[PDB]
């Protein structure tokens, strides 16, 4: 019934394909968790579905409609189950509308770097929901194997502002309330949906030209940032050029950061990275930008394969470092020096405590380092382009990665990657052949 994730076995609905979220969120007091919601989901199906089963954790549904007609629905524990008048079959789409209100609940589970979900602190409310927190404020197929496009209308007090993933179009104001509209036009996972409300300011930068492609530039600056919380001029353009030369075209229409005066890890929310100031370093800004490809465009089929996101985002830091004239092998050796004193594991995680551990970041990066040094920078760069293309529109798996390596690069290259994928012991540091 559910997606059947190996880490979170109850999330999502098997065969459900949400294609667009049309969300109208109203945040009456930024900084406090209460909110109300009005969302219409455009859903398709990969198998016949008698019901639409959505994740929701906290708020209470008050009304539901299907294609504009009243429909039978029930809220059970962590799910909203909607019985359709007839099954939704592959090739068809329907519009499920849900009216809800209440307090999002955090899924803060010990073994995760955050309590994921709707965050509320210091006059700000914002989404920081990787892996399974979006269900706190949005009835959603809350699994990265079902990315979707988003249109978000955020209604906030006039004194406040709001920013969400997607290009900002309109802002209207009545009765002391402002409503802002953002359109995320390339599909991204539920947790990749950026949404921040509170005292914040929008700052545009000149367009970035990546050959034919134009990438808009916009950052968010919340009030009360520490001194020296900046995006160095020109850095994001150089990062976009260097990363897109490695991975292929940038997947989105805009990139920037939302700098927050809070103490938290950064999250690669689509086109607008949620960037607490304590994480605002060059290497994190690169990391989060790399994730726009590996995580937001190329999405995970199963939360056990987090290293496909975190390892690839981590290896981009070394590609960026080399691009800036630094020694890549020395950085790889630093990754290894930090893993040599830590427990190691195969790259496929089996427990939630492992999905964001040192192996997912650095053992995955060193896995890519072993592959790159085996096939050469030319072959490696052509494989990263192929990888992004092969898994655009299709969730990626560790198995699918190895098969693509054998396919494209050969059996020897596949076996080089596999020793890093499999095996509990940490392999020796990948070093140039010579
Ligand atoms: C605390 S969850 C954030 C994960 C994100 N991919 C990172 O680089 O830290
Ligand atoms: Na989808
Ligand atoms: Zn990351």
DSSP string, 373-428: HHHHHHHHHHHHHHHHHHTSSS-B-HHHHHHHHHHHH-HHHHHHHHHHHS-SSPPP
- Give the CA distances from residue 116 to residues 23, 88, 97, 132, 180, in Å, rounded to whole numbers and listed in that order: 20, 31, 25, 7, 24
CA–CA separation, 347 vs 359, rounded Å? 7
Same-domain pairing of 222 and 160: no
Same-domain pairing of 211 and 307: yes
Work out the burial of residue 180: count CB atoms within 10 Å of its CB; fewer than 13 is exposed, 13-18 middle, 19 or more buried.
buried
Element (H, E) at 187: strand 177-188
CA–CA separation, 147 vs 346, rounded Å? 27
Domain boundary among 175, 200, 225: 200
Same-domain pairing of 21 and 97: yes
Domain boundary among 200, 226, 241: 200
Q: Nearest residue CA, atom 4 of ligand 1? A: 267
Q: Is 414 in the pocket of ligand 1 (CB under 6 A)?
A: no
Q: Nearest residue CA, atom 3 of ligand 1? A: 267
Same-domain pairing of 369 and 387: yes
226 CB neighbour count, 10 Å cutoff:
10
Element (H, E) at 132: none
CB 163 within 8 A of CB 200: yes
Sign of CA dihedral 76, 82, 85, 89: negative
Same-domain pairing of 231 and 131: no
Q: What is the resolution of this structure in A?
A: 2.2
CA–CA separation, 413 vs 373, rounded Å? 10
389 Cα distance to chain centroid: 18
β partners of residue 150? 21, 184
272 Cα distance to chain centroid: 11
CA–CA separation, 85 vs 61, rounded Å? 19
Beta-carbon contacts of residue 352 (< 8 Å; ≥ 6 apart): 7, 8, 109, 111, 112, 303
Query: What is the 152 CA–ligand 3 centroid distance (Å)?
Result: 25
| Paired tokens of 17 | 């394909």
End-to-end CA separation in angstroms for the chain: 53
Q: Nearest residue CA, atom 5 of ligand 1? A: 267
Closest by alpha carbon to 58, among 106, 10, 13?
A: 106
Note if the bond before 131 is cis, omega within 30 degrees.
yes
Closest by alpha carbon to 274, among 262, 283, 282?
A: 262
| Residue 20, domain extent | 1-200
Beta-carbon contacts of residue 168 (< 8 Å; ≥ 6 apart): 180, 181, 182, 202, 218
Same-domain pairing of 151 and 101: yes
Q: Is 379 in the pocket of ligand 1 (CB under 6 A)?
A: no
Closest by alpha carbon to 364, among 379, 349, 350, 376?
A: 349
Q: Is 113 in the pocket of ligand 1 (CB under 6 A)?
A: yes
Same-domain pairing of 174 and 312: no
CA–CA separation, 73 vs 100, rounded Å? 13
The method recorded for this entry reads: X-ray
Same-domain pairing of 319 and 194: no
CA–CA separation, 348 vs 35, rounded Å? 37
Q: Is 27 in the pocket of ligand 1 (CB under 6 A)?
A: no
CA–CA separation, 433 vs 326, rounded Å? 20
Judged by its nearest atom, the ligand closest to the C-alpha of residue 146 is: 2
Mutate which of 133, 191, 267 for ligand 1 pocket (most atoms within 8 A of beta carbon): 267
| Paired tokens of 234 | 């020109």
Same-domain pairing of 7 and 22: yes
Indicate the length of the chain as a whole number.
Answer: 434
β partners of residue 148? 188
Same-domain pairing of 219 and 324: yes
CA–CA separation, 182 vs 165, rounded Å? 7
CA–CA separation, 230 vs 222, rounded Å? 12
Q: Is 112 in the pocket of ligand 1 (CB under 6 A)?
A: no
- Kindly tell me the number of DSSP H helices and DSSP E strands found in the chain: 8, 20
181 CB neighbour count, 10 Å cutoff:
18
CA–CA separation, 118 vs 126, rounded Å? 6
Sign of CA dihedral 193, 383, 145, 352: negative
Q: Which residue has the tokens 């499999």?
A: 422
Domain boundary among 153, 177, 200: 200
Same-domain pairing of 24 and 118: yes
CA–CA separation, 166 vs 183, rounded Å? 4
| Paired tokens of 83 | 């019985």
Same-domain pairing of 208 and 264: yes
Closest by alpha carbon to 167, among 210, 215, 206, 119?
A: 215
Query: What is the 307 CA–ligand 1 centroid distance (Å)?
Result: 11
Question: Which of helix, strand or coil describes residue 121?
Answer: strand
CB 179 within 8 A of CB 154: yes
| Paired tokens of 328 | 């890549």
Domain count, the chain: 2
Radius of gyration of the chain (CA): 21
CB 11 within 8 A of CB 21: no
């Amino acid at each position: 019934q559910s997606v059947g994730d190996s880490i979170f076995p109850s999330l999502g609905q098997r065969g459900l394909d949400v294609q667009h979220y049309d969300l109208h969120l109203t945040v009456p007091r930024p900084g406090e968790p209460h909110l109300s919601g009005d969302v219409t989901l455009t859903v398709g199906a990969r198998e016949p579905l008698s019901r639409i089963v959505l994740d929701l954790l906290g708020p209470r549904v008050s009304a539901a409609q299907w294609n504009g007609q009243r429909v039978r629905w029930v809220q059970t524990a962590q799910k909203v189950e909607v019985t359709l008048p007839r099954p939704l079959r592959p090739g068809e789409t329907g519009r499920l509308r849900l009216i809800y209100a209440g307090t999002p609940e955090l899924s803060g589970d010990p073994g995760l770097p955050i309590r994921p979900g709707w965050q509320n602190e210091a006059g700000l409310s914002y989404s920081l929901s990787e892996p399974h927190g979006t269900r706190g404020f949005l009835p959603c197929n809350d699994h990265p194997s079902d990315p979707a496009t988003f249109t978000v209308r955020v209604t906030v007090p006039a004194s406040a502002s709001a920013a969400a993933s997607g290009l900002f179009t309109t802002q209207t104001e009545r009765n002391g309330l402002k409503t802002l509209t953002f359109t995320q036009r390339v599909p991204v996972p539920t947790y990749a949906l950026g949404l921040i409300v509170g005292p914040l300011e929008r700052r545009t930068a000149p367009d970035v030209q990546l050959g034919t492609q134009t990438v808009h530039r916009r950052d968010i600056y919340a009030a009360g940032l520490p001194a020296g919380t900046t995006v160095p001029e020109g850095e994001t353009a150089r990062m976009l050029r260097v990363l897109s030369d490695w991975f292929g075209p940038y997947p989105d229409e805009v990139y920037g950061v939302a700098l927050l005066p809070v103490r938290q890890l950064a999250l690669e929310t689509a086109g607008l990275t949620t960037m607490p100031a304590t994480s605002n370093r060059e290497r994190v800004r690169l990391h989060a930008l790399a994730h726009q490809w590996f995580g937001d465009q190329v999405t995970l089929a199963d939360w056990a394969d987090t290293w496909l996101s975190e390892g690839f985002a981590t290896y981009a830091e070394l590609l960026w470092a080399e691009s800036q004239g630094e020694d890549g092998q020395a950085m790889a050796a630093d990754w290894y020096a930090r893993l040599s004193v830590l427990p190691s594991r195969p790259l496929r995680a089996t427990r939630e405590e492992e999905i964001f551990d040192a192996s997912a970041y650095f053992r995955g990066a060193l896995a890519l380092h072993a592959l790159r040094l085996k096939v050469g920078d030319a072959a490696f760069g052509q494989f990263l382009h192929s990888y992004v293309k092969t898994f655009t529109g299709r969730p990626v798996s560790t198995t699918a990665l190895l098969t693509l390596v054998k396919t494209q690069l050969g059996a020897e290259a596949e076996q080089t990657l596999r020793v890093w994928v499999e095996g509990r012991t940490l392999p020796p540091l990948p070093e140039p052949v010579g």
